[PDB]
Amino acid sequence: YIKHPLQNRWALWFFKNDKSKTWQANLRLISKFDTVEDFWALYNHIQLSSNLMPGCDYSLFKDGIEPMWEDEKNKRGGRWLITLNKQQRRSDLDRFWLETLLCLIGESFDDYSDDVCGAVVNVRAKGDKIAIWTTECENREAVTHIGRVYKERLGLPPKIVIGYQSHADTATKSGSTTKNRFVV
Ligand SMILES: C[n+]1cn([C@@H]2O[C@H](COP(=O)(O)OP(=O)(O)OP(=O)(O)O)[C@@H](O)[C@H]2O)c2nc(N)[nH]c(=O)c21
Ligand SMILES: O=C(O)/C(Cc1ccccc1[N+](=O)[O-])=N/Nc1nc(-c2ccc(-c3ccccc3)cc2)cs1
């Protein structure tokens, strides 16, 4: 009977790389949820009925935030980016992505989870990517707290840093090695 409210409401987005297009016109809102039961119903189903493919990306964002730099909650923000080796086991990708989602819907960064906008997985033959997007790239204390807890929660090796990129820098990159406002 009684569903267990997620403290907050969430939307899953899909993106299939059409690039003739306007980037934003390729998003797709898949469905929304705000209970523990509906999260797992969606996660279980999407995993079994989907297939990993290059260019086909997924985003989970708080209700009302579109997963794009242009959104008001994202324009001043940035992301903690995890870049996977080409060589990683699919098992790693699965675990990292679910652990990321659980950090989102479980509000794992305590008072700083209010800075969290969503998370994105990019499926790329060059190397898969997972990131948590936050709303203000100049909030050093919130951004660095989120980064540290996130890196630990995924059990990443302490010797390799992960980087926080501002969306403003990402969009204007040229080397296509975007610089990191912060590392952890
Ligand atoms: C997240 N994002 C990505 N793009 C565009 O999609 C392209 C691919 O951005 P990408 O995030 O898909 O990285 P990819 O691994 O495919 O390549 P990378 O650029 O070397 O990191 C980018 O060059 C952007 O032009 C975006 N374009 C807009 N307008 N808004 C966005 O929020 C946005
Ligand atoms: O073979 C393969 O590529 C398979 C099939 C498969 C089949 C059986 C067992 C395991 C596997 N698997 O992938 O580990 N890909 N499935 C895939 N799921 C996703 C995906 C994307 C987004 C979300 C999500 C769901 C809810 C909320 C937020 C995000 C959940 C999943 C992308 S691709």
Q: What distance in Å separates the CA atoms of residue 19 and residue 132, rounded to the nearest whole number?
A: 24
Instruction: Please check if 107 is assigned to a binding site.
Output: no
Where does residue 144 rank: exposed (0-12), middle (13-18), buried (19+ CB within 10 A)? Answer: middle
Contact partners, residue 28, CB within 8 Å, separation at least 6: 13, 14, 15, 16
One DSSP character per residue, 85-141 reads: -TT--HHHHHHHHHHHHHHHHTTTTGGGGGGEEEEEEE--TT--EEEEEES-TT-HH
Supply the angle between the helices 140-153 and 90-105 in degrees, to the nearest 10. Answer: 130
Where in the chain are the domains?
1-184
Q: How far is the CA of 93 from the centre of ligand 1 (A)?
A: 20
Residue 174, both tokens: 């040229």
Residue type, 50: S
Nearest Cα to 126, choosing from 85, 171, 174, 81?
85
Q: Is 96 in the pocket of ligand 1 (CB under 6 A)?
A: no
Give the determination technique. X-ray
Q: What distance in Å separates the CA atoms of residue 118 and residue 99, rounded to the nearest whole number?
A: 13
Q: How far is the CA of 133 from the centre of ligand 2 (A)?
A: 21
Supply the angle between the helices 90-105 and 36-49 in degrees, to the nearest 10. Answer: 160
